[PDB]
Design a protein around this ligand. Structure first.
Ligand SMILES: Nc1ncnc2c1ncn2[C@@H]1O[C@H](CSCC[C@H](N)C(=O)O)[C@@H](O)[C@H]1O
Ligand SMILES: [Cl-]
Length: 199
């Protein structure tokens, strides 16, 4: 809605400007219900959260005791995460490029929310390879996927068939659920998808 002077979503400065001016349409202001029920099913799982933004989910996982690393290449995003994490859990977030970052553990679960749809279309192929590289066979890429093409972006919507073309060479779809606490921008568009890394 506002007039931003950064336009390249590949740049951390792009996301800085949105956080800095308080224009963050994607922000849930909390932990989504489906994240909570999925995480309860995988209480021991080591979790990577790329493009974590405010990182509400990392605070929640800290309370459940999962190993977790949340990363965001945006300084303003990491400042937002620190506000949520406080000094107590600040070490769970790092300012890092998802496409460069090596986690200090092998993830059992990489949690997706409003990250794939933050990426320019040209970064989608990298996303798939990176997820496949990070996840061993049987491990999970699971979270909220923003389905259906959009005219502009971000958020860049993705057609179901294009998402298949991206992930099925590496993942089997094993869950596709309606979401019952979605915010306006994602209402009726996001779904919870669980992808299992192929062996
Ligand atoms: N290559 C990259 N590595 C790490 N973070 C990235 C990234 N590309 C985009 N991002 C980050 O992804 C975020 C998209 S906004 C989504 C934030 C959060 N996942 C939420 O659900 O609320 C921004 O904070 C941006 O800085
Ligand atoms: Cl986003």
């Amino acid at each position: 809605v506002p007039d931003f002077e950064t336009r390249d979503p590949n740049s951390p400065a792009f996301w800085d400007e949105r956080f800095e001016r308080r224009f963050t349409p994607w922000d849930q202001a909390g932990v989504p219900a489906a994240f909570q029920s999925f995480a309860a099913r995988h209480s021991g799982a080591a979790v990577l959260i790329p493009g974590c933004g405010s990182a509400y989910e990392a605070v929640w996982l800290a309370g459940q005791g999962n190993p977790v690393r949340a990363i965001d290449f945006s300084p303003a995003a990491v400042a937002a995460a620190h506000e949520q994490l406080g000094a107590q859990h600040a070490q769970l977030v790092e300012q890092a490029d998802f496409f460069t970052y090596e986690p200090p553990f092998t993830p059992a679960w990489i949690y997706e929310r409003a990250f794939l749809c933050a990426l320019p279309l040209a970064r989608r192929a990298d996303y798939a390879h990176r997820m496949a590289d990070l996840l061993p066979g049987g491990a999970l890429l699971a979270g909220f996927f923003f389905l259906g093409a959009t005219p502009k972006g971000p958020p860049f919507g993705i057609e179901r068939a294009e998402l298949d073309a991206l992930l099925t060479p590496y993942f089997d779809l094993i869950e596709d659920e309606a979401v019952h606490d979605s915010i306006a921008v994602f209402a009726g568009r996001e779904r919870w998808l669980t992808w299992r890394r192929r062996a």
